[PDB]
Each structure stands twice: as structure tokens, then as C-alpha cells.
Amino acid sequence: AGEILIKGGKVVNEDCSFFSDVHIRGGKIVEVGPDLRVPPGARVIDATDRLVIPGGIDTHTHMELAFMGTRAVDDFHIGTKAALAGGTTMILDFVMTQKGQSLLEAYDLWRKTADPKVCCDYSLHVAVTWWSDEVKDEMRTLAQERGVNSFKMFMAYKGLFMLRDDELYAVFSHCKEVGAIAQVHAENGDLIAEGAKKMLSLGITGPEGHELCRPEAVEAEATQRAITIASAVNCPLYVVHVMSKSAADVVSKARKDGRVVFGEPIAASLGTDGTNYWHKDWAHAAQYVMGPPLRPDPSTPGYLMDLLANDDLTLTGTDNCTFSRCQKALGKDDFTRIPNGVNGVEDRMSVIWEKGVHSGKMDENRFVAVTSSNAAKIFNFYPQKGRIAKDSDADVVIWDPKTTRKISAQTHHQAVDYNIFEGMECHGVPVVTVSRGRVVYEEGRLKVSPGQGRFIHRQPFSEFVYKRIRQRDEVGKPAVVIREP
Ligand SMILES: [Zn+2]
Ligand SMILES: [Zn+2]
């Protein structure tokens, strides 16, 4: 609502950067070009010496998720405010369907919880945590009527969310039928379960036990297995929260081999590492506990950033699923009871800019691709989002790439009372955030109301995801050999 001219900045899209003003009217970008006239009444945002970029799209959040006996402290309201303050203008959150629970009920429950609270736009992925004719039907309804083209399956969480290979095969085959992308939490749940039992029996109850019970081989194995099942049914696959060099190399190899798979590292795995689980201070070490775990090889985040730069890995989320210090403390005697999840929604943009662009690993245009455009392409709303262009949504960040900010829980906007990036000096600061054509963050202050954001309804068969799948259906059908009868 209202009129904004962003003037004097350099627009940065995934394909190129160029000086131009951006005219916003009624929630949309209505013109991009040099020296645009300021209509009477329009507010001018002076973007001199700034980049004008699509707002960040966080593909992976769990706002106020009830999980492991408690509830994430960053909710849809505070979580989306913190996203905005960090230059992120859309989140995509997981409807964590309980085993045996209607996917439509869980979807409805998420929409009712988020719709009146979100401060930025959002959409939803739906977890498929069990399988039956009903789930099958509900997935079709969700894909065709409820705006969801992404379903999330777990190979870990035995007893809770885990699906076996035969069930993944059926679920993935049905994703492909409904034009959805199959997302997978890829760790071998049987090894996690055994490993945790073994670490506890050895008296390793601390957070080091959490990483040691499921080292990167456990993630690499499940990642390859999911790729292989999805390749078998020609279903596009999306591997969420790639945490390790070996799982990332699995995704890298499969893509080079032409498999339709996408890998999503998160701010945590790009900005820090798992040496923190070995910290003498139990509270500090617990802060980093999430599944899969961050990895103790300190070369990990830089390697994941190199693969993200090279498009072995294609886009980013945060897996934001926050628990306060006193919540984490529930597992002081037993790591299996530390609620799993770290922060990142607010810091993702600056973390990636500092670790990826300022470092020389990727340019500003690849930065836009891996923080917004690719999410829009995969989840099917590009160029509505992820591009500064006429007719696109006015979710726009004015970005200062030269100034640094120090990340701290003392100054962050998340509800959690610590930050895994505590102390990190990042180049790249969101100075102004515009969401739905309104200035919602400037001069370090938020100006937004819960429920101002909107659910984004997507259609299935995202072309970025499916055009190759469909062609392979047409020319890749196996053929009988013709033999004399
Ligand atoms: Zn997960
Ligand atoms: Zn997650």
C-alpha cells in the first residue's frame, strides 16, 4: 500500500547487476529504470551506495514448532520480524504432520497459527510422516488446491517421522504424480538410534555424544540412498540442511550425473561448525545441537560455501528451530533430550554475504540466486519473488555490502537468548527492508504488524523442477527387446 521510489542504488538480480531506480506501487514493483520521477506523495528510499536486491527467501523454518517435549521460542510473529530485520522477506515453514494425523488437518492448523501472526510472506511445505490411501489423497489435494508443491520425508526419527525405503519409493512416486518436489531429511535413522544408545552407554551424555552418534557418513549414506530411490522413480528430490562435506559431495556427484536433485545447506552449516559440541561449557555446546549435527571438521563451512558458489549446492535456508538456554538445559544429563535446533533466520543474509561474497567465493548475483531466486524457482513463484523486475512483488532489501555488523544475541531480534554466530563480524547489512511494498525495517527499527504477511499459494509442476523430468518420461521409458516369439 502506498508508493515508494528506491533511488540511486544498484539493482542486483541473479543474472546481472545494473544501476536503476525501482518504483513500487501497491505491493508491486511497477517500474525499474534509471532516473525515475518521484510521483507526488511517494516516499524516496535513498539507495546511493547500496545494492537493491530481492528480499531473502528462507526455504527452511520451523517457527513455534512443538518438538522434543517443548516448543520453539521463535514463533511466527517474532520469527518473521527477525527475518525482516535480517533482510529476509519470506519464510517457508514445515507443517510437521504427526504420524497417523491428517495432512489436511496439520496444514489447516499451521495456516490458522501463522496467518494472523506472520509479518512477512510465507508458504508451507507438508511433511509426509506416514503412508496410506488417505495420505495419498491428501497430498493431491494439498498440491492442487492448497498451494503446496513440496512434501518432506524423513529417513531419521525412527518411531516418530521415519519412513522405510519401500515407503519412500511409494511416496516419491506419488510426489512425481502430483507435480511436487520430494524433500528429504537424509540421515540413517537406524544408525542414529543405535549410535545414541551406544554413546549413552559409554557415559558420553554431552553434546559431543550427539555428533559422535551420527557422524557425517550417516548423513552421506541416507543422502545417496534418497537420490537413488528418487532416481528410480524419476521424482525430483530436494535434500534439506546439508551439513557435511561428504553429503554435499553426494549431491554434487548426483547432479553432475544428471540426477534431478537440489541440495540446501543452511546458515548454520555455512557459518559455523561442530567443534562447538566439544566446548568445555555445556550450555554453549548444547546451543549448536540440531539434526543432522554440525561437523567437527573445520573445513566444512568453507567447503559447503564453495559448493554453493559452484551450484553443487543450489540455495539456502536456516532450519530455524530455536530453543532457549533453559529449554536446551532439558538434556543436561542426556544429549538425546536436548531439543534439536539452532537459530539463523535473522542472520542468514549477512552470514552468507560475509562467508560467501566478501570472501571472494561467489559474486553478488550468485548471492541473490542462493538466497532468493532459486527458492522461488524451485517452489514455483519466480519471478513473482526473487527478482527486481516490473510486476514482481515488492519484497526488496537495500543492502550495504561494505559496512559490517557484529552478530550478537544482545542485539538480535530473535526470541532465543543466544546466537550460534555470536560475535561474528559480517560485511553486508540490510539497511532497509520492504515487504509487500511497505517499509517494514529501517534505521534499525521494525515497523510491521502480525498478520501483515500473506500465505503464498503455489501451483505444482514447477518448470525449473519438472521440465527435464517430463522430457525423460517421454524419451527415457525402458523398452522391451523384440524377440522371435
Ligand atoms: Zn531435518
Ligand atoms: Zn528442518
Q: Is residue 459 a part of any domain in this protein?
A: no
User: Rg of the chain over CA atoms, in angstroms?
Assistant: 22
- CA nearest 312: which of 264, 381, 383, 272? 264
E strand intervals along 77-167? 88-95, 121-127, 150-154
Q: Is residue 30 a part of any domain in this protein?
A: yes
Per the structure, the count of domains in the chain is 1
Q: Is residue 458 a part of any domain in this protein?
A: no
Sequence-distant (≥ 6) Cβ neighbours of residue 42 within 8 angstroms? 2, 3, 4, 5, 23
Strand, helix or coil at 350?
Answer: helix
461 CA distance to ligand 1 middle (Å): 24
Taking each helix axis from N to C end, the angle separating 189-201 and 216-232, rounded to the nearest 10 degrees, works out to 170
202 CA distance to ligand 1 middle (Å): 26
- CA nearest 269: which of 96, 405, 421, 166? 421
Expressed in Å, this structure's resolution amounts to: 2.0
Sequence-distant (≥ 6) Cβ neighbours of residue 253 within 8 angstroms? none
- Three-state SS annotation for the chain: CCEEEEECCEEECCCCEEECEEEEECCEEEEEECCCCCCCCCEEEECCCCEEEECEEEEEECCCCEECCEECCCCHHHHHHHHHHCCEEEEEEEECCCCCCCHHHHHHHHHHHHCCCCCCEEEEEEECCCCCHHHHHHHHHHHHHCCCCEEEEECCCCCCCECCHHHHHHHHHHHHHHCCEEEEECCCHHHHHHHHHHHHHCCCCCHHHHHHCCCHHHHHHHHHHHHHHHHHCCCCEEEEEECCHHHHHHHHHHHHCCCCEEEEEEHHHHHCCHHHHHCCCHHHHHHCCCCCCCCCCCCHHHHHHHHHHHCCCCCCECCECCCCHHHHHHHCCCHHHCCCCECCCCCHHHHHHHHHHHCCCCCHHHHHHHHHHHHHHHHCCCCCCCCCCCCCECCEEEEEEEEEEECCCCCCCCCCCCCCCCCCEEEEEEEEEEECCEEEEECCEECCCCCCCCECCCCCCCHHHHHHHHHHHHHCCCCCCCCCC
62 CA distance to ligand 2 middle (Å): 6
69 CA distance to ligand 2 middle (Å): 16
Count the helix, strand and coil residues of the chain and give each as a percent rounded to the nearest 5: 35, 25, 40
Q: Is residue 485 a part of any domain in this protein?
A: no
Q: Is residue 476 a part of any domain in this protein?
A: no
Per DSSP, the residues of 52-68 read: EEEPEEEEEE-TT-EET
Backbone φ, ψ for residue 211 (5° rounding): -70, -45
Q: Is residue 267 a part of any domain in this protein?
A: yes
**Beta pairing partners, 51:** 10, 399
321 CA distance to ligand 2 middle (Å): 7
Backbone φ, ψ for residue 194 (5° rounding): -65, -40
291 CA distance to ligand 1 middle (Å): 6
CATH code, domain with 392? 3.20.20.140
196 CA distance to ligand 1 middle (Å): 17
In one-letter notation, the amino acid at residue 276 is N
Q: Is residue 466 a part of any domain in this protein?
A: no
Rounded CA gap, 45 and 112, in Å?
Answer: 34
Ligand nearest to the CA of 93: 2
Where in the sequence is the domain holding 125, given as residue range(s)?
1-444
Alpha helices per DSSP H over 57-102: 76-85
Q: Is residue 31 a part of any domain in this protein?
A: yes
Quickly tell me which residue has 517421454 as its cell.
474
289 CA distance to ligand 1 middle (Å): 12
Rounded CA gap, 413 and 246, in Å?
Answer: 34
5 CA distance to ligand 1 middle (Å): 40
473 CA distance to ligand 2 middle (Å): 31
Report which secondary-structure segment, H or E, holds 466. Answer: helix 463-475
218 CA distance to ligand 1 middle (Å): 14
- CA nearest 292: which of 213, 346, 356, 229? 213
Cis peptide before 292 (omega within 30 of 0): yes
Ligand nearest to the CA of 242: 1
Rounded CA gap, 164 and 198, in Å?
Answer: 23
